């Protein structure tokens, strides 16, 4: 009973510091804090609803933060494909409309294809474009990305102008908007102690 409470305090504090690190573009720190949170997941945390929301947001951010490492897997799927799955889960569990998550779904799918193209993984880019963009977005963009792949044209403006920093900061901005504002109890007590 006591350990659960502290465990949640600890998870929530490190969630707060992970966001702070992600928001400051300190991804090395983000990953170190992520690994601490990962190790916490095997300990009792109380009712699953008390932590489900922050954990979904942290899952999505963790997959986005690894989005450029195609030598990395969260599902036996490239990291940005995994993030798409988590985004769907967030839509359902957070009781969001399709319209509210549409522009974010669009950013992640476009990022998933563009990263494959940037690493010259044209076959992976093609399979991702067919799996996630066939049944959602516009035919001209599909056609543009297809032709970029067929021609291996990394010089195309869609590729050249893509910024992964901007992409993941936009993703953090959307994900954060669905979180409560309470400052973590541990951080409060640390301010009072110092």
């Amino acid at each position: 009973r006591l350990e659960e409470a502290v465990n949640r305090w600890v998870l929530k504090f490190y969630f707060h510091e992970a966001l702070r690190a992600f928001r400051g573009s300190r991804y090395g720190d983000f990953r170190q804090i992520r690994d601490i949170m990962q190790a916490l997941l095997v300990r009792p945390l109380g009712k699953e609803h008390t932590v489900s929301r922050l954990l979904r947001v942290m899952q999505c951010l963790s997959r986005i933060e690894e989005g450029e490492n195609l030598d990395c897997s969260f599902d036996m799927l490239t990291p940005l494909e995994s993030a798409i799955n988590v985004l769907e889960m967030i839509k359902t569990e957070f009781t969001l409309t399709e319209a509210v998550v549409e522009s974010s779904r669009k950013l992640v799918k476009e990022a998933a294809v563009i990263i494959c193209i940037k690493n010259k993984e044209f076959e992976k880019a093609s399979k991702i474009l067919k799996k996630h963009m066939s049944k959602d977005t516009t035919q001209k963009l599909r056609n543009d990305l297809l032709n970029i792949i067929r021609e291996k044209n990394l010089a195309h403006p869609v590729i050249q102008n893509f910024s992964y920093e901007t992409f993941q900061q936009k993703m953090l901005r959307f994900l954060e908007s669905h979180l409560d504002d309470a400052e973590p109890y541990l951080l409060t007590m640390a301010k009072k102690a110092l």
């Binding site: 997941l41 489900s52 954990l55 979904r56 899952q59 963790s62 897997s73 036996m76 990291p79």
Partner: peptide, 16 residues
């Protein structure tokens, strides 16, 4: 069923 809490909410990548 057999899914664990750590599995459902896995944060770190399985293969890196």
């Amino acid at each position: 069923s057999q899914e664990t809490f750590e599995e459902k909410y896995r944060l770190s990548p399985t293969l890196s």
